[PDB]
Amino acid sequence: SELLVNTKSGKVMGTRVPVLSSHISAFLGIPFAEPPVGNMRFRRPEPKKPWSGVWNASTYPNNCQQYVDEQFPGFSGSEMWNPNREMSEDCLYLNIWVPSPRPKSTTVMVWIYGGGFYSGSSTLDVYNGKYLAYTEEVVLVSLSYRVGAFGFLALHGSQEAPGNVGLLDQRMALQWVHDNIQFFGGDPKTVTIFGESAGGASVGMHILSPGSRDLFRRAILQSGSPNCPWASVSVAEGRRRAVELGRNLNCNLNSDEELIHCLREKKPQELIDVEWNVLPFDSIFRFSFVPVIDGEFFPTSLESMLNSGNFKKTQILLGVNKDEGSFFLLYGAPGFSKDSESKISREDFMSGVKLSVPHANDLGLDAVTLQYTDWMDDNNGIKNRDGLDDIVGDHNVICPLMHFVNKYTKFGNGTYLYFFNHRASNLVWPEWMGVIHGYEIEFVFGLPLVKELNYTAEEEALSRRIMHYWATFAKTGNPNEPHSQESKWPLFTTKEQKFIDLNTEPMKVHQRLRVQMCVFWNQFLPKLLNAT
Amino acid sequence: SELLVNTKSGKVMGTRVPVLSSHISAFLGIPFAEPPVGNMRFRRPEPKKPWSGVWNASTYPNNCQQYVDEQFPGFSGSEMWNPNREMSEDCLYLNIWVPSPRPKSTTVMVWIYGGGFYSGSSTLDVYNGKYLAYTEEVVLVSLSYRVGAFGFLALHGSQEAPGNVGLLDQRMALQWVHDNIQFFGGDPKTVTIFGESAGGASVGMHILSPGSRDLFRRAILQSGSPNCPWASVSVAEGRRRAVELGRNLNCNLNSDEELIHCLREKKPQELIDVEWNVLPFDSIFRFSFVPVIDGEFFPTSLESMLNSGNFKKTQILLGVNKDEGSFFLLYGAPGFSKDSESKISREDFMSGVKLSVPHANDLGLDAVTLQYTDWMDDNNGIKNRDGLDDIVGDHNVICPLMHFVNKYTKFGNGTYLYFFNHRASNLVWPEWMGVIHGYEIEFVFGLPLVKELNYTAEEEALSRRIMHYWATFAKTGNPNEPHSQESKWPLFTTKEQKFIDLNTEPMKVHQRLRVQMCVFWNQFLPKLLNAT
Ligand SMILES: *[C@@H]1O[C@H](CO)[C@@H](O[C@@H]2O[C@H](CO)[C@@H](O[C@@H]3O[C@H](CO)[C@@H](O)[C@H](O[C@H]4O[C@H](CO)[C@@H](O)[C@H](O)[C@@H]4O)[C@@H]3O)[C@H](O)[C@H]2NC(C)=O)[C@H](O)[C@H]1NC(C)=O
Ligand SMILES: *[C@@H]1O[C@H](CO)[C@@H](O[C@@H]2O[C@H](CO)[C@@H](O[C@@H]3O[C@H](CO)[C@@H](O)[C@H](O[C@H]4O[C@H](CO)[C@@H](O)[C@H](O)[C@@H]4O)[C@@H]3O)[C@H](O)[C@H]2NC(C)=O)[C@H](O)[C@H]1NC(C)=O
Ligand SMILES: *[C@@H]1O[C@H](CO)[C@@H](O[C@@H]2O[C@H](CO)[C@@H](O[C@@H]3O[C@H](CO)[C@@H](O)[C@H](O[C@H]4O[C@H](CO)[C@@H](O)[C@H](O)[C@@H]4O)[C@@H]3O)[C@H](O)[C@H]2NC(C)=O)[C@H](O)[C@H]1NC(C)=O
Ligand SMILES: *[C@@H]1O[C@H](CO)[C@@H](O[C@@H]2O[C@H](CO)[C@@H](O[C@@H]3O[C@H](CO)[C@@H](O)[C@H](O[C@H]4O[C@H](CO)[C@@H](O)[C@H](O)[C@@H]4O)[C@@H]3O)[C@H](O)[C@H]2NC(C)=O)[C@H](O)[C@H]1NC(C)=O
Ligand SMILES: COc1cc2c(cc1OC)C(=O)/C(=C/C1CCN(Cc3ccccc3)CC1)C2
Ligand SMILES: COc1cc2c(cc1OC)C(=O)/C(=C/C1CCN(Cc3ccccc3)CC1)C2
Ligand SMILES: *[C@@H]1O[C@H](CO[C@@H]2O[C@@H](C)[C@@H](O)[C@@H](O)[C@@H]2O)[C@@H](O)[C@H](O)[C@H]1NC(C)=O
Ligand SMILES: *[C@@H]1O[C@H](CO[C@@H]2O[C@@H](C)[C@@H](O)[C@@H](O)[C@@H]2O)[C@@H](O)[C@H](O)[C@H]1NC(C)=O
């Protein structure tokens, strides 16, 4: 049967699912590791022991234990990101959508969710793979991985909580796909990994990590890059946070073994309740338990790896949304609210600046302020608001990505860069937030093709075009149809630095994406903070 | 007789001079101090001993000993600034132009020449007072003062070369005018002092200095302000330069008395030949012998005087030209030449930056570079050229003036600010230099009213208008005619910071003159250089 697939871990049975007037097969909730429970909490994942019988893969798995947003109860704009299944530490599963009839050897795309390394779920409506799998004839996988302290608590030197285990979860799922996707009709030599935000950083981290590179062919990074200032900590900062987490739960702190034992006795919600207490600064766009630069997953600093070409050389497609900062200001900074235009006073601007760049001395804060203030009109509330939005977006997403892309392109085999600046017509967040972090994802997974969801015809066309770029890139390493009459997305090269806008208008090509602001964040400010 | 005037120093006889189809009287070369020669070299000036007989004041006096520009021999653009009389240490004289018939009590305007404190002459064609005196019915005085080491050599603690004597020269001429201008028909209570560049700084310095303030009523500063980074040095830096000057001339350096004695034996040209050797940095827009912050002429630092309101409170009219930097780049920086468009390579840009801000550490140089580079187009030769022109103008003239004007306005009794951006149609310097430092002076002295000099009709009108603003300001403290139908130059206030463009087009009013760049030079960069 089409819904029966025999794999090297055992048989699995999927389910036929309707999609846009047709059908495909879905295999939901396949386990790829042993449940990381009890004394395995905080440990490297172990491969799932093979099963006899037929593994029922007709329904979505549990989501990993995580912080749940309750800021806007019942509001679809926030709740679209929250877990839509029960949470459990028993959450290492993946999902596969397969065209019908079963292909023989087709391009595979593996989705790595974002969520700041502290949240996220493979089961969200907006990550449903059926539209993309159906429309573009790809086998679409979404994996899962431990987040929060369960994924990232790091006591370097210990084997019981080494750190990075959530990244090892992702890698184990990609090993599973490498080993098994052939039985589903996928081609294991044309596996493209793709992700957004922390998921994009994660993609980058597998490009870098020697122990993951061989498992995939090429890569798409959306609004995230491995060098983002929020995406990793040093082993000392990681240890500090794990000890502070212990302090918050009245743990014995005298040794790794005492702390870990104490942390493993706690219910998952107890860790989540105090997780945000361990951050060293009052800050926005900063998460507590993130990847650690350990010497093992990452053999040296990310900057030395990037500079020396210590990474997988392949093709990458990547980009950013216009207003990356807005979500984090809404949730994290004074004077930004959901139902107000959120015009900002000089005083909320200056506070915002300090929250945005937590590691900065006063001179550094004055440099950032100068760089984004219009001194002809320094009391404009709108300008102050948009200015902070740009500070946050630039520092945390756009400029780290630009630096990644410039470094990667020197050694890699083909780079395509985009700037997504179309605000969805049915966006339920306010207008001041603009083209918000995350809101390209619906276009990439083809939601606008569904009439009920209330997108325009032009948004449908934009989504079709995005999907086809993403899938043709995954198939061939180039998002353009070799002999199309359609306008061509050119390659980003070192010299010319080209990129395209992705929106409903005819394709425009530009050069040197936010270069003015990125020289400030990537070259001048770090030099400034180093000299003081 | 009209050409005979009896003064408290003695009688003087002037000469009738033709001007624009009419005539006025001129009294040229009146002495105001004893010749500062022999053992009086470097000393405070002494008042001229009164004379019997009639002092022949029919011809211009000698110019003070100074460096003479030979870079473009015979070229009118440079030679218009060089001494047009014989040079002599016997050079403390003034010139007076008086309407005909002799007025009873009319507004007096006293011109203080520029020249970087190392050069300048009261006798230049472009400073001829006859047009202004005639057209606006003012008594026009131009004074002179010692420049170079003769005016500014400073060995603080010594009475033989205290420093600032060139400023005491100016003050002695203003004392003379205060005491005597009544005999010429001038009103000693409506004396306006005005000057350009070093002359403008000098005006500012008399506003500040307690020992000069009572001698005049109000003030005009053109492209110069007392706080300019080139216009003064500390007593330690002054001493250092006077000792280095001595080193250059194989002087005994063991005491002030040995050094000064040695320096007084030298011919004037020997000092001038090595004067530029004493500058501490490789720099542009920096002159060797300038005013010293001594505790006496200036009782405390210029910034504390400005902050505390320790200055004369009156009305001031002041402004800048659009391309103040260009002259100094031409003369001082590699890649700028007179007969080339002077497009500048990245490497000549970076060199230029370092010459422009000599006191700056590397981080400071990177800050200035960032502030003026368009990173979308960083190899444009034109942009690099114009960018350096702006750096030089901003740092040295515009931003110090903006800071002066903002500080002064808090305590003063009325401020009028202009931005002169009309390039003379007959300018003989190249186009790349734009609206060059010094080239408003011809409009202020009414040269465009003279047909032979080849200005347009619109330039004539612009000059008439400028002259009438300057003279009505001197008369009343307000450059506008109380009940004119003409457009009004508004007052610069603390809150609104208004200014006007001076050019051939209908008056436009704007606010916050180069505020973006001036926050950088006036607030951020100094903070940066202080923290390193
Ligand atoms: C991604 O990587 C692929 C695969 O590595 C890479 O394709 C390579 O491109 C180069 C062209 O730069 C090819 O090298 C040429 O091969 C031919 C015949 O095989 C030679 O005769 C060529 O030499 C001539 O031309 C040279 C100019 O580059 C001269 O230097 C020389 O003196 C000769 O006149 C030349 O070596 C190479 O074979 C391909 N390989 C394949 C399989 O296509 C591709 O360009 C990379 N893409 C990106 C965006 O980086
Ligand atoms: C696509 O667009 C359509 C067309 O606009 C849209 O349908 C609308 O959806 C909302 C669903 O929430 C409907 O609003 C409800 O209407 C009923 C009946 O009048 C009310 O009882 C509801 O009020 C309850 O809930 C409120 C808000 O949650 C509370 O504040 C209140 O106390 C009640 O508890 C509620 O207002 C609306 O009627 C339709 N509009 C039309 C014209 O049909 C659809 O949802 C969009 N589709 C998608 C997938 O987004
Ligand atoms: C330059 O300096 C001149 C001279 O010093 C200065 O002119 C002064 O302006 C003020 C107006 O601010 C005058 O003060 C007023 O005088 C009248 C009558 O003599 C008083 O009745 C006034 O009091 C009323 O209004 C006040 C509002 O300012 C209220 O505070 C008060 O309660 C009353 O209702 C007031 O004190 C002052 O007399 C003049 N002096 C002269 C000679 O004009 C001028 O404004 C300065 N110019 C600039 C640009 O700074
Ligand atoms: C106002 O504009 C008028 C009209 O253009 C202008 O008159 C011009 O002035 C210059 C004065 O230098 C004249 O040029 C000279 O002409 C004679 C005769 O043809 C030549 O012998 C001269 O050559 C000598 O000097 C040269 C440059 O200095 C040397 O390079 C050469 O070897 C010779 O030594 C010289 O070229 C020119 O003739 C007139 N033009 C006209 C049309 O009358 C006037 O000067 C302007 N007025 C002011 C005050 O600027
Ligand atoms: C409980 O404390 C915090 C919670 C949050 C933030 C900060 C917090 O404390 C400093 C924050 O910035 C937050 C930002 C939003 C990021 C974007 N997500 C939605 C999203 C998820 C995955 C990929 C794209 C968008 C909503 C929360 C949430
Ligand atoms: C001999 O050495 C130098 C000579 C000069 C400069 C620099 C020098 O060495 C560092 C300089 O900047 C110079 C600039 C110019 C300033 C503007 N003047 C004309 C002018 C004089 C008074 C008022 C306005 C303009 C011409 C020379 C001249
Ligand atoms: C496979 O699963 C289908 C849906 O299962 C649902 O969730 C699981 C955990 C059970 O609790 C089940 O009763 C729920 O309906 C079933 O409809 C289907 O019968 C199952 N098929 C087989 C062969 O087990
Ligand atoms: C006053 O001066 C006029 C111009 O003087 C000129 O320069 C002086 C220094 C003398 O050298 C003189 O011969 C030059 O002509 C004379 O024309 C005029 O005669 C003088 N008048 C009197 C009364 O001395």
Author numbering:
A (entry chain A), B (entry chain A): 4 to 535
What does the paper say about this structure?
The N-benzylpiperidine moiety adopts an almost identical position/orientation within the enzyme catalytic gorge in the crystal structures of the three TcAChE–ligand complexes.
The average distances between the closest indanone and Trp indole aromatic carbons are 4.1 Å and 4.2 Å in TcAChE-1 and in TcAChE-2, respectively, while the same distance averages to 3.7 Å in TcAChE-DNP. Although 1 and 2 share a similar interaction with the TcAChE active site, the presence of a second methoxy substituent on the indanone moiety of 1, as in DNP, allows a better stacking against Trp279 accounting therefore for its slightly higher inhibitory potency compared to 2, being the Ki values of 11.12 ± 2.88 nM versus 29.86 ± 1.12 nM.
